[PDB]
Design a protein around this motif. Structure first.
Motif, PDB file in Angstrom:
ATOM      1  N   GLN A  17      12.950 112.006  22.822  1.00 25.86           N
ATOM      2  CA  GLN A  17      13.828 112.955  23.499  1.00 25.86           C
ATOM      3  C   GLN A  17      13.252 114.363  23.472  1.00 25.86           C
ATOM      4  N   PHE A  18      12.724 114.789  22.321  1.00 26.92           N
ATOM      5  CA  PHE A  18      12.156 116.130  22.226  1.00 26.92           C
ATOM      6  C   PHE A  18      10.882 116.254  23.052  1.00 26.92           C
ATOM      7  N   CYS A  19      10.058 115.203  23.082  1.00 27.26           N
ATOM      8  CA  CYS A  19       8.838 115.255  23.881  1.00 27.26           C
ATOM      9  C   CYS A  19       9.132 115.223  25.378  1.00 27.26           C
ATOM     10  N   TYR A  20      10.170 114.498  25.808  1.00 25.31           N
ATOM     11  CA  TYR A  20      10.540 114.542  27.221  1.00 25.31           C
ATOM     12  C   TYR A  20      11.153 115.885  27.597  1.00 25.31           C
ATOM     13  N   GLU A  21      12.014 116.439  26.738  1.00 26.59           N
ATOM     14  CA  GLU A  21      12.640 117.710  27.074  1.00 26.59           C
ATOM     15  C   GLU A  21      11.685 118.886  26.940  1.00 26.59           C
ATOM     16  N   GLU A  22      10.562 118.726  26.241  1.00 23.46           N
ATOM     17  CA  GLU A  22       9.534 119.751  26.345  1.00 23.46           C
ATOM     18  C   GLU A  22       8.571 119.482  27.491  1.00 23.46           C
ATOM     19  N   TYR A  23       8.410 118.219  27.904  1.00 20.03           N
ATOM     20  CA  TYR A  23       7.568 117.931  29.058  1.00 20.03           C
ATOM     21  C   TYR A  23       8.209 118.431  30.346  1.00 20.03           C
ATOM     22  N   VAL A  24       9.524 118.259  30.493  1.00 21.65           N
ATOM     23  CA  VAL A  24      10.183 118.724  31.713  1.00 21.65           C
ATOM     24  C   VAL A  24      10.240 120.251  31.731  1.00 21.65           C
ATOM     25  N   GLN A  25      10.238 120.885  30.556  1.00 19.89           N
ATOM     26  CA  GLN A  25      10.189 122.340  30.511  1.00 19.89           C
ATOM     27  C   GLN A  25       8.790 122.851  30.827  1.00 19.89           C
ATOM     28  N   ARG A  26       7.756 122.111  30.419  1.00 18.97           N
ATOM     29  CA  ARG A  26       6.397 122.487  30.796  1.00 18.97           C
ATOM     30  C   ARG A  26       6.112 122.174  32.260  1.00 18.97           C
ATOM     31  N   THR A  27       6.832 121.214  32.840  1.00 20.30           N
ATOM     32  CA  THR A  27       6.697 120.922  34.263  1.00 20.30           C
ATOM     33  C   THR A  27       7.394 121.987  35.101  1.00 20.30           C
ATOM     34  N   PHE A  28       8.644 122.311  34.757  1.00 20.40           N
ATOM     35  CA  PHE A  28       9.367 123.367  35.457  1.00 20.40           C
ATOM     36  C   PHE A  28       8.809 124.745  35.128  1.00 20.40           C
ATOM     37  N   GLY A  29       8.132 124.885  33.991  1.00 20.82           N
ATOM     38  CA  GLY A  29       7.425 126.113  33.701  1.00 20.82           C
ATOM     39  C   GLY A  29       6.038 126.066  34.304  1.00 20.82           C
TER      40      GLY A  29
END
Lengths: 74, 74
Positions: free
Chosen positions: B53-65
């Protein structure tokens, strides 16, 4: 009757770059009973027109003479 | 009816890494007289679920960032 879908093109460029010399002629377009998104699309078109015009200017004034005889002493 | 053998997965990750996040989420584990091994693989499953969960929610933040426009003047 219809057209292609609009691009992604997120953000507004005048709010991010208000220190470029195209902004006065860019701000000349104002809405006369036009909605928000329609004026913003016409704003994006009027911004790419001024950007294209100034880029054509910056292509022209360097390809008059790309060298110069006068800068040989300089 | 049954399942595969479990992987090796030696040690406990939450004990050797206390300065890591997502352990406040890992504190509340509903053990109602769960045996000394069943709670171990329940800890395994919930820990890898919180990590994914933490790796997906940081991946989507790095994608939207993306490289932004306010990061271009920066």
């Amino acid at each position: 009757a219809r057209r292609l879908p609009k691009p992604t093109l997120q953000g507004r460029l005048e709010a991010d770059f208000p220190d470029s010399p195209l902004l006065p002629k860019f701000q000349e377009l104002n809405q006369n009973n036009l909605p928000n998104d329609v004026f913003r699309e016409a704003q994006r078109s009027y911004l790419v027109f001024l950007t294209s015009q100034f880029c054509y200017e910056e292509y022209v004034q360097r390809t008059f003479g790309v060298p110069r005889r006068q800068r040989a002493i300089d």
